[PDB]
């Protein structure tokens, strides 16, 4: 199943991502250094911040309350489609999902 990571500088990383793995985890495993994932994926750090493409923003299960509180601390611009990618779990229905990665996590 496939995921596209668009960096801030326009750079593109297309990635094959197994089902069940979070979008954070696939990124950190594959050289996508503009996603940090410091807390290791429990919505405790906000350093896995991404912007979900509008076409998929409603296909993804809603952020729970812990994710929403954590999102208030992102260091880049907080947008309506900001998500913590450790909380986005890859599924076949998300095939081709595009996420844009902020210019900073720290």
């Amino acid at each position: 199943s496939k995921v596209v990571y668009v960096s801030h500088d326009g750079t593109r990383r297309e990635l094959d991502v197994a089902d069940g793995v979070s979008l954070m985890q696939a990124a950190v495993s594959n050289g996508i250094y503009d996603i940090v994932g410091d807390c290791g994926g429990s919505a405790s750090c906000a350093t896995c911040h991404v912007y979900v493409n509008e076409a998929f923003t409603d296909k993804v299960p809603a952020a729970n309350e812990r994710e929403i509180g954590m999102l208030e601390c992102v260091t880049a611009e907080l947008k309506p489609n900001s998500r913590l990618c450790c909380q986005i779990i890859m599924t076949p229905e998300l095939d081709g999902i595009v996420v844009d990665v902020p210019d900073r996590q720290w």
Binding site: C39, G40, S42, S44
Partner: protein, 392 residues
């Protein structure tokens, strides 16, 4: 040596567990802790040992408690018995510059050569104390590499780190000697920098201004010491296990691509850290009344041994579908060294199995485990037929 039951602790929650000397230690330390998860043991118990404290026994509680920093504070993480979140975040930002995934990936080739150089000097002897001969010198040499320290400084550093874990010197004295070794180096590399760990720390910024030499040496000291005991002992649990499981060895030899996954299953099965938190206020937690100031042990090792989280938890299955553990911790303080630790383990298994595919525990040897905040292996004598090895 037991403490009196506090008024608010009900008798039916009392459980006899000494985390420094558990009853069934000879079956192995993970086995000794799993008695906390036998069939009618409560999810949250109280022991009279080591001053008296709570122990959460299930991954569900352990995760919840580590996520709830508001009730469960890290001001006192050890049994028996800090800095604000804004400084904490900046601390972790800098540590991630030093030891984050980008650093590890580009460091991997030199880690691999070190692992190789270490094993090749061992291979033609046909025996070793793995703990003393590989497990201990490997991570300390990896730190020198990361920090750009010269090879001839090891026996001194080796000596100082051991005294924080062992000789003839207070812990405070050993820490100061380690600090006193770092400060001249920090000052030299400050403002006139390189790309090594020490230069990066020395040139870091905190609250808009340069990191002080004091803040820098503690950060440096902490990155050096935090990566020793846990790595040394985890490698030994792992290599002890492989020595006893020829079939598991063969799987990785025939399919070296499964070694990262195998590494994750060994991290679940031979998990080894247990610290905790302290209650910031009175709190009703899963039907249990905790009082302000109570200490609660939240053993990172027990989440992955929990049968409610992993079917047949004592079984090592390298093809295990959903590996669940909290071996590097959980929540905001999850191990900032996890990417370096994983690469060290993966490189070790690969470079060892490539050269020394066949080995066992030395005949008659009793492998003794030790229990504590970081559990470990006392000694690991291995033997092998040197003609069955392969120089690479």
């Amino acid at each position: 040596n037991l403490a009196p039951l506090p008024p608010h602790v009900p008798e039916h929650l009392v459980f006899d567990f000494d985390m420094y000397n558990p009853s069934n230690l000879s079956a192995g330390v993970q086995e000794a802790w799993a008695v906390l998860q036998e069939s009618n043991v409560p999810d949250l118990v109280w022991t009279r040992s080591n001053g008296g404290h709570w122990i959460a026994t299930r991954g569900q509680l352990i995760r919840e408690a580590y996520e709830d920093y508001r009730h469960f504070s890290s001001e006192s993480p050890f049994i028996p018995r800090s800095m604000d979140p804004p400084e904490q975040r900046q601390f972790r930002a800098l540590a991630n510059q030093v030891v984050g995934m980008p650093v590890v990936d580009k460091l991997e080739n030199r880690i691999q050569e070190l692992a190789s150089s270490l094993i090749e000097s061992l291979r033609p002897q046909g025996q070793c104390n793995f703990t003393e001969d590989y497990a201990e010198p490997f991570p300390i040499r990896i730190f020198m590499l990361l920090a750009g320290l010269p090879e001839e400084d090891i026996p001194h550093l080796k000596y100082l780190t051991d005294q924080m874990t062992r000789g003839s010197m207070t812990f405070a004295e050993a820490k100061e000697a380690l600090y006193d070794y770092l400060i001249p180096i920090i000052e030299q590399r400050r403002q006139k920098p390189g790309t090594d760990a020490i230069s990066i720390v020395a040139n870091g910024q905190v609250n808009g201004r340069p990191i002080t030499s004091d803040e820098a040496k503690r950060m440096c000291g902490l990155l050096l010491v935090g990566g020793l005991d846990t790595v040394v002992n985890f490698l030994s649990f792992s290599m002890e296990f492989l020595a006893k499981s020829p079939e598991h060895r063969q799987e990785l030899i025939e399919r070296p691509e499964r070694i990262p996954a195998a590494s994750e299953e060994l991290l679940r099965r031979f998990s080894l850290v247990a610290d905790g938190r302290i209650l910031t206020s009175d709190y009703e937690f899963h039907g249990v009344q905790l009082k302000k100031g109570d200490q609660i042990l939240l053993p990172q090792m027990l989440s992955g041994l929990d049968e409610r989280e992993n079917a047949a938890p004592m079984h090592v299955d390298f093809s295990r579908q959903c590996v669940s553990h909290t071996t590097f911790g959980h929540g905001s303080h999850l191990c900032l060294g996890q990417h370096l630790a994983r690469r060290e383990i993966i490189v070790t298994l690969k470079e060892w199995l490539t050269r020394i595919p066949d080995f066992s525990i030395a005949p008659g040897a009793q492998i003794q485990h030790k229990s504590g905040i970081v559990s470990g292996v006392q000694a690991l004598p291995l033997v092998w037929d040197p003609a069955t090895t392969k120089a690479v």
